[PDB]
Design a binder for this molecule. Sequence first.
Ligand SMILES: O=c1[nH]cnc2c1ncn2[C@@H]1O[C@@H]2COP(=O)(O)O[C@H]2[C@H]1O
Ligand SMILES: O=c1[nH]cnc2c1ncn2[C@@H]1O[C@@H]2COP(=O)(O)O[C@H]2[C@H]1O
Ligand SMILES: O=c1[nH]cnc2c1ncn2[C@@H]1O[C@@H]2COP(=O)(O)O[C@H]2[C@H]1O
Ligand SMILES: O=c1[nH]cnc2c1ncn2[C@@H]1O[C@@H]2COP(=O)(O)O[C@H]2[C@H]1O
Lengths: 195, 195, 195, 195
Amino acid sequence: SSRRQYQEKYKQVEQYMSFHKLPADFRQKIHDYYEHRYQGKMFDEDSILGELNGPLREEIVNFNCRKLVASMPLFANADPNFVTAMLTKLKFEVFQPGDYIIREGTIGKKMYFIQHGVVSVLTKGNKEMKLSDGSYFGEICLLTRGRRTASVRADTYCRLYSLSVDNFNEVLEEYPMMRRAFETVAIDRLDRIGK
Amino acid sequence: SSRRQYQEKYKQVEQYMSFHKLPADFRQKIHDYYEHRYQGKMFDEDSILGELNGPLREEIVNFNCRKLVASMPLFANADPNFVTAMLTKLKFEVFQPGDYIIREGTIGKKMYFIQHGVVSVLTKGNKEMKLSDGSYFGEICLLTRGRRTASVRADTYCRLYSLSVDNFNEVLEEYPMMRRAFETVAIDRLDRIGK
Amino acid sequence: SSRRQYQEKYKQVEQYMSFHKLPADFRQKIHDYYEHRYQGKMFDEDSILGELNGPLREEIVNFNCRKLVASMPLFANADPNFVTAMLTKLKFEVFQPGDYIIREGTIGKKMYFIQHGVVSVLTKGNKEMKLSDGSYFGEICLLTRGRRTASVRADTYCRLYSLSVDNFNEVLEEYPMMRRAFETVAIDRLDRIGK
Amino acid sequence: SSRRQYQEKYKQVEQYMSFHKLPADFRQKIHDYYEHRYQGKMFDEDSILGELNGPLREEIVNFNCRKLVASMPLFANADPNFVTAMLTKLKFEVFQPGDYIIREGTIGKKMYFIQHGVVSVLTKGNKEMKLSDGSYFGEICLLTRGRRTASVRADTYCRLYSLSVDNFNEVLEEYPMMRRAFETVAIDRLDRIGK
Ligand SMILES: O=c1[nH]cnc2c1ncn2[C@@H]1O[C@@H]2COP(=O)(O)O[C@H]2[C@H]1O
Ligand SMILES: O=c1[nH]cnc2c1ncn2[C@@H]1O[C@@H]2COP(=O)(O)O[C@H]2[C@H]1O
Ligand SMILES: O=c1[nH]cnc2c1ncn2[C@@H]1O[C@@H]2COP(=O)(O)O[C@H]2[C@H]1O
Ligand SMILES: O=c1[nH]cnc2c1ncn2[C@@H]1O[C@@H]2COP(=O)(O)O[C@H]2[C@H]1O
């Protein structure tokens, strides 16, 4: 039944690609994205969660994110109520190899937690660094309100969870002691890239 | 026919739970919630009320809330036009036993009127107090813009009506004399919990 | 086909009324409203007009409102481009006999143009006055940002077009010379009701 | 299948026109618009692009707009990342011969890039000028926050891409060096029309 709803949606994407005469390799790339992102199933997730209440939604995001939470010290060792407030504002995103998730110099308005995948952190000239499952990136712009200090490129398929600057700020107003945890990491990174 | 629309919606929830591999007890808890919240029937309530006008919507909320109004002195003894302005901005919510409706220390942005159910008011150390049909809670944060002064936990299934801080403020701009009614109760409660 | 879409929508309203156990006279009142408001036909008007462009939407509202425009000196004698800017922001509303469209003392945020119907203007004590096809009301609050100076009650079924304070202000920023036309009428009315 | 979705949508437009008793020539004009705008096919484009990610959406708009980009020096010779930020915020619009896309004296909040078509630029008295594929108009109001300095009328069917003032400002905050490119053209035009 879910296999069916994904099928009808994907048919519309196919029609969109056909109308716009997208090339063959591009259509395959979009197909592969859809299979990785939705895994052959689709539901009106916003309508469903909207029909619930706060406690149920909170129990669901905690259950779904058990591995993300336990695998990242920032979350694992934090007040579970801070963790819940973060989890409720995360957006699942999938990226493909070679995607520029972040471009250096742009104005950043979201950060990313890596559930699964490897990314390259690229700066003018300081040797590529890598981040994987359990790490996060894009926090510096959220803290500074300035420009991205590096590009971040997917090496693999990446399952990420994003957090918008407005949501990051709302949570940190509620849990101001957690602001320093991010600030400490941002400062260490700014030092390491010397800029 | 309504029995039918609830059935199709609930099938989607079942599919969501299946995809996310939620445990058996959790799936039952979500089923029980849905039966209590929607009572086997569903309609596009927002579309319906949207097709009406102000007078009809006002007549409907007044009719539906006759018992809530008559059972709560704040409403029963107030200008019926204030009562209508409140009723039009209430959101029906259902909570299950053990749910933390409010957590102490968090930043509150809504209050609750109890149509039916019992809740426990819990503070660091002052002996649990109980609130039931005809009472309300969560007003203090709405008045102070500060942090919740207690946790409130459902003891029973609870049928509540919530009111957002923005809506509470809009109504009280129109009916500023009613602001003191809430302030008096908030002050009495802050005294009783000594903090 | 439109007769069909209205039928399916109205069935949902019937189900809503049944679920909430609304009284017989109330259900009839809602039926009569629906027949007067939609005249047995329904379409997704917002989706349709959304698919068009500015020029087509403007040509449509002008065509539909030819009688409203020609029957009201404020519009008939104005810059047709001001008239178009007003017409595009009007919302069709239907009221039934006895409805309080406006209540004295409330904070007003919309005004009304009467396409067809009769209303009574009611103030503490100054003798009921009547307004009909070609007139408008609710402008004073829009101009003053204060409280309604009278109640306005439908005597008949009324076909009205409303204009929100924000839309009224946006149009009058573009066409500031038209602000005085409304101000002159508001002042004359404030004089007549002496308050 | 897309031919089918356009057919069902157009039937609703036909029903809307019938209900409002629009004249024959007007109904034909709306039919011709729909054929030019949608070319007999329709999909939920917002839902589709919403299911993708940033990189895919960016690859799609770049592919679809290759000719617009290569045919306009402002884009062709710019940082491709600026171009992408512009392209992602463009809205496709179709206008018909004689449409007033912009009226002199009004408060402007969007500019237009011409993919295909010819427009006339009309001012009080300075001889009509023409703009075509590869040019843009409506930038001056975006820069000045004042009133339109000319009317712009479609001579032909026009395929345009619009950009809102808020989006224009957001992009130019990110790419402030591109602000001067528009300012230089605006100044040259203000000189030429002497006002
Ligand atoms: O030395 C580093 N080791 C690991 N990560 C790093 C390092 N330097 C930068 N980053 C990440 O790259 C992001 C680019 O966007 P941002 O400026 O908003 O935040 C940055 C950091 O999260
Ligand atoms: O002594 C009390 N008797 C009954 N209720 C109480 C008492 N103390 C607090 N409360 C309620 O608990 C809420 C917690 O959220 P809040 O801070 O926004 O508002 C509080 C009050 O409504
Ligand atoms: O003497 C009057 N003759 C006709 N109309 C009048 C007179 N007095 C008031 N009104 C209308 O009643 C409205 C009540 O809402 P409002 O205060 O926003 O604007 C008022 C006027 O439009
Ligand atoms: O001399 C001119 N040659 C070509 N175009 C011109 C000239 N003068 C004005 N325009 C365009 O007309 C628009 C009217 O709206 P706008 O004031 O926001 O921006 C204007 C310019 O883009």
